[PDB]
Amino acid sequence: MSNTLRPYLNAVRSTLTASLALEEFSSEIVERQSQPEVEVGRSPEILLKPLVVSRNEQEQCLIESSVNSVRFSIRIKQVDEIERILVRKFMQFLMGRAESFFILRRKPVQGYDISFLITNYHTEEMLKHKLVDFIIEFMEEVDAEISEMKLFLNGRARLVAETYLSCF
């Protein structure tokens, strides 16, 4: 999908590509340790201002940034309780695999559906123009993925209805 999200995802792509200017940074509060400074927040001068990009009261991105780390968190469309359950569960499979999607958090920040942490090491050892293409191609497709799952849920609600009702 794209054409209704096109204004929004060009704002997110442009914010996120301006945000992903990361660097190696050894921590100022602990010796011989680097830490993702957006996630610890203990030294304020190397944080950048947290920016929101947003289409709607439901659909939003929060972008938080720092000298060696970016945290990106999104709320996606959930217009009925079937999308609340289908989204909330789908993101728990998608974050349950975070060890193999290297940029995922294992938990969202409070009040967001899914959250990403792009650390310096990822922008050194992965293609950072393909990182934002993955974040954006996720935000385009996830509404089509979830809407398709509520079709398959209706399809099984019929399967069991016909199979029960046709043996009287």
Partner: protein, 362 residues
């Protein structure tokens, strides 16, 4: 301007230095090793590793006339390496006395002392004593409020610029007695004891890079807000003649180099060097050195058969993931003189987070 790709390193290369013969170069892989590379006809070959650091190496430098390498790491140490007559390198631990990581190191122009930036809010100016065979460190510490991101020395041995994460660029005296001759009375000052401050210049974002003009009569520095600023001092305790800030339309600069008294190359997260030109009346961005600014069947190999199936399987589809149009594929971490008389750079080099080491001729 022309780009020549000298080598592709297997790991990110935040810093490098070519020796004065331009025959070999040292570089910091993103581990505790430092690689040494030598010429191999037209190629380059890996000669040896240094590995004396405990944690990730952060910066490295190579003294031109005296032929000594100096290294910094997140382990808070520095080492100076000096050539033994048999052809191998003598390591030597320098007691920097730092409470937190060492970030960035430079030899002074006379090579008798070297300065190390830190996360510890301080800069360790180190010098050697023939009385003790020690290296000993003096801490510049009065105005510095946060991590030091880069250093550059004035062409006279005393003055040290430092870019700090508290959004300011400092000019400090690093005069150490019984090493330096007296500093000449000059635009930055004349009453010039250790840690006296010649400027605390502002920036919109973290100051990644600093460097004095070849005449020493101006300072240029570069912000994470993607601007370059050139400061023209007047006298001590007095406002500057000009503080020209040019704001780029691109991602931030991370490194900076005066080409001559009227032109600067700069490079960083934009993946490309740029050229700026001007004087105390005004400055402007004027060229991109990379032609990639303009964004410019037969038999099939077994490795193209295997990779077109591994692309269909691991990725979306057979089609290759494209190059960036620039020579570098990732942020260009450092930018260094290579050839021409001092104050008329004719060629420079850069090394990237992608591991390219590249020679640029103007």
């Amino acid at each position: 301007a022309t780009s020549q790709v000298l080598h592709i390193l297997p790991k990110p290369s935040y810093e490098h230095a070519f020796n004065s013969q331009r025959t070999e170069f040292v570089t910091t892989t993103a581990t505790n090793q430092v690689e040494l590379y030598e010429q191999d006809g037209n190629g380059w070959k890996h000669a040896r590793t240094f590995s004396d650091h405990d944690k990730i190496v952060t910066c490295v430098d190579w003294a031109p006339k005296s032929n000594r390498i100096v290294t910094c790491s997140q382990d808070r140490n520095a080492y100076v390496y000096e050539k033994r007559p048999d052809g191998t390198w003598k390591q030597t631990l320098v007691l920097l006395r730092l409470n937190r990581a060492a970030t960035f190191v430079r030899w002074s122009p006379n090579e008798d002392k070297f300065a190390v930036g830190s996360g510890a809010r301080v800069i360790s100016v180190c010098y050697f004593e023939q009385e003790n065979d020690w290296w000993v460190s003096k801490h510049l510490k009065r105005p510095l409020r946060s991590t030091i991101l880069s250093l550059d020395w004035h062409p006279n041995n005393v003055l040290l610029a430092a870019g700090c994460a508290d959004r300011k660029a400092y000019v400090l005296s690093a005069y150490v007695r019984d090493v330096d001759a007296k500093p000449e009375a000059s635009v930055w000052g004349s009453r010039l004891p250790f840690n006296t401050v010649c400027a605390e210049y502002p920036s919109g974002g973290w100051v990644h890079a600093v460097g004095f003009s070849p005449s020493g009569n101006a300072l240029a520095y570069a912000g994470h807000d993607s601007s370059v600023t050139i400061a023209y001092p007047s006298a001590p305790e007095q406002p500057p003649r000009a503080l020209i800030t040019v704001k780029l339309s691109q991602l931030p600069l991370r490194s900076l180099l005066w080409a001559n008294e009227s032109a600067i190359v700069a490079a960083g997260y934009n993946y490309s060097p740029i050229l700026l030109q001007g004087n105390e009346s005004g400055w402007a961005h004027t060229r991109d050195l990379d032609a990639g600014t303009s964004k410019t069947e037969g038999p099939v190999s077994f490795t193209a058969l295997r990779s077109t199936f591994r692309n269909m399987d691991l990725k979306g589809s057979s089609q290759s993931i494209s190059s960036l149009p620039t020579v570098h594929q990732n942020m260009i971490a450092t930018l260094r003189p290579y050839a021409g008389t001092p104050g008329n750079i004719t060629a420079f080099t850069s090394s990237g987070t992608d591991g390219r080491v590249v020679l640029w001729t103007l």
